[PDB]
């Protein structure tokens, strides 16, 4: 395993998802996308500093918090190779079941670190949310607020969606899940018919790694498709020419949050793509080492 960036964790409410890649939060892509919305309204052209004084401060604190867990990440990577490389396994002096117990303890400690050291920043996300709700209030319109920008940003978003190869990922993950369990069932039969446990544990462990990353690939794929399908629906549906300000606020929140999910999943699906590509090359090689 060259990199273990594929690990993530969500809060106990399962509402805030933290990733090892910038900006770690979808909410920052929300706030980053608000820098586009605020440029079109001369009535609120004060967010250029707020994005720099607050959103950049929140992002800088988020990057530092992940770096604190880097020492804990290096400990997990060491246990990854001992368990996935039988040649490296034959050097230590404990059983495989004893090494799994050290892996689950170190993994959740690393995943728990990303959440524990970022709890102060997750509470800051809702702070800028209310500031955005308050900042948008300064629009001089009240009952006939313009919706041209709202649909114009959907025009921009649907262009970025065509660069996203969602169909290729679905066929990729379909073959992968078909190839994953097919190799798992083949190991289930060989398990009792040979006597090479050290190599079989490297299979089942790398299979467990694939199974977890597949779960992350399936979740990020569905969240991307949901954002793509919902934003597309707002362009094919009704197009009101002017709505109220309170109605316009949730509009920016609706597409500003959805596009944050798409860009967040685009960063994760790309990373989870190579992670599954790399991890499968381990199992295919490890089975070649069995014959």
């Amino acid at each position, epitope marked *: 395993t060259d990199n273990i960036d594929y690990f993530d964790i969500s809060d106990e409410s399962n509402y805030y998802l933290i990733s090892q890649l910038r900006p770690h939060f979808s909410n920052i892509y929300f706030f980053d996308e608000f820098k586009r919305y605020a440029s*079109y309204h001369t009535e609120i052209k004060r967010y250029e500093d707020i994005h720099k004084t607050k959103v950049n401060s929140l992002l800088n604190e988020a990057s530092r918090a992940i770096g604190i867990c880097n020492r804990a990440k290096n400990t997990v990577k060491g246990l990854i190779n001992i368990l996935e490389n039988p040649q490296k396994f034959k050097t230590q002096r404990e059983s495989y079941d004893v090494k799994l117990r050290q892996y689950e303890e170190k993994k959740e400690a690393f995943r728990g670190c990303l959440l524990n050291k970022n709890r102060k920043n997750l509470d800051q996300i809702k702070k800028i949310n209310n500031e955005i709700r308050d900042l948008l209030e300064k629009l001089k319109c009240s009952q006939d607020c*313009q919706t*041209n920008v709202y649909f114009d940003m959907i025009k921009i978003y649907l*262009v970025d969606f*065509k660069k996203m190869p969602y169909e290729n990922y679905d066929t990729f993950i379909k073959q992968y899940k078909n190839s994953y369990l097919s190799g798992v069932d083949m190991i289930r039969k060989i398990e009792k018919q040979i006597d090479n446990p050290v190599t079989i544990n490297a299979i089942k462990f790398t299979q467990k790694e694939m199974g977890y990353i597949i779960d992350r690939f399936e979740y990020h794929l569905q969240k991307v498709k949901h954002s793509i399908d919902q934003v597309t629906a707002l362009s094919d549906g009704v197009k009101p*020419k002017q709505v109220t300000k309170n109605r316009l606020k949730e509009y920016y929140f609706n597409i500003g949050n959805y596009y944050s999910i798409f860009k967040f999943g685009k960063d994760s699906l790309n990373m989870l793509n190579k992670a599954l590509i790399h991890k499968e090359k381990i199992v295919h090689n490890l089975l070649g080492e069995l014959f």
Partner: antibody, heavy 117, light 108 residues
Framework: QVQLQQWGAGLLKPSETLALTCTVY????????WNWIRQSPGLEWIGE???????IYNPSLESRVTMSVDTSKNQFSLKLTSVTAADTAVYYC?????????????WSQGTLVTVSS | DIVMTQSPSSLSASVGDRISISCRAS??????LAWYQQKPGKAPKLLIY???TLESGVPSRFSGSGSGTDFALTINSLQPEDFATYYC?????????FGGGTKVEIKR
């Protein structure tokens, strides 16, 4: 939706200053990227400006173009200098959303500019 | 300074025909192309942007294809309401360069 209305002086003596202006109806003249294109019997791109701070002109006439955006009056103006017969064309203003998404959805009806004494 | 060139410069077709104008770019321009239509004594009307995206309300017979260097606009079922001069414009770099135009004279 947003509309564009262009007004200016068509006839121009040489060496004068071609000064046009486009007033935006249905939307604010702010963060949008506003372009200027001229057509002579083809379509030549003059320049683009934005309230954000990105203003780019065509190198062929960079040394003579001036653009501005008035958020209060909801207007943006183009300016040409040292005008000659080579600048006789129909001048359009158009709206671009972003600096990487420069397709121009609305066009003004144009102002036929003739350079002659 | 990207040089956009579109061919043919003139085109004549039947009423129920199907034409296809091509636009070639001097350099790679990814999928950043806008196709326009200009009727006499009017302003250019947007038809297709980003090579494949159709503008709202534009008739669906207008087809956009191509990526990178070469592209093509295809009218699929001609109509007397399509006699115009069609252009292609890129926006991967500045300055924005327009095509030469393609006059489509309908035969009746």
């Amino acid at each position: 939706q947003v509309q564009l209305q262009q007004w200016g002086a068509g006839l121009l003596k040489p060496s004068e200053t071609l000064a046009l202006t486009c007033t935006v109806y249905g939307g604010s003249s702010s963060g949008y990227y506003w372009n200027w294109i001229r057509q002579s019997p083809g379509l030549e791109w003059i320049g683009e400006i934005s309230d954000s701070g990105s203003t780019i002109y065509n190198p062929s006439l960079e040394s003579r173009v001036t653009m501005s955006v008035d958020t209060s009056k909801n207007q943006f103006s183009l300016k040409l200098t040292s005008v000659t017969a080579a600048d006789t064309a129909v001048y359009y203003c158009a709206k671009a959303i972003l600096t990487r998404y420069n397709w121009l959805d609305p066009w003004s009806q144009g102002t036929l500019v003739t350079v002659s004494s | 300074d990207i040089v956009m060139t579109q061919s043919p410069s003139s085109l004549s077709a039947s009423v129920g025909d199907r034409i296809s104008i091509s636009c070639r770019a001097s350099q790679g321009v990814n999928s950043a192309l806008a196709w326009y239509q200009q009727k006499p004594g009017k302003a250019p009307k947007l038809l297709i942007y980003d090579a494949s995206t159709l503008e709202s309300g534009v008739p669906s017979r207008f087809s956009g294809s191509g990526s990178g260097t070469d592209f093509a606009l295809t009218i699929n079922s001609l109509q007397p309401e399509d006699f115009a001069t069609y252009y292609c414009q890129q926006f991967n770099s500045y300055p924005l360069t327009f095509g030469g135009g393609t006059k489509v004279e309908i035969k009746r």
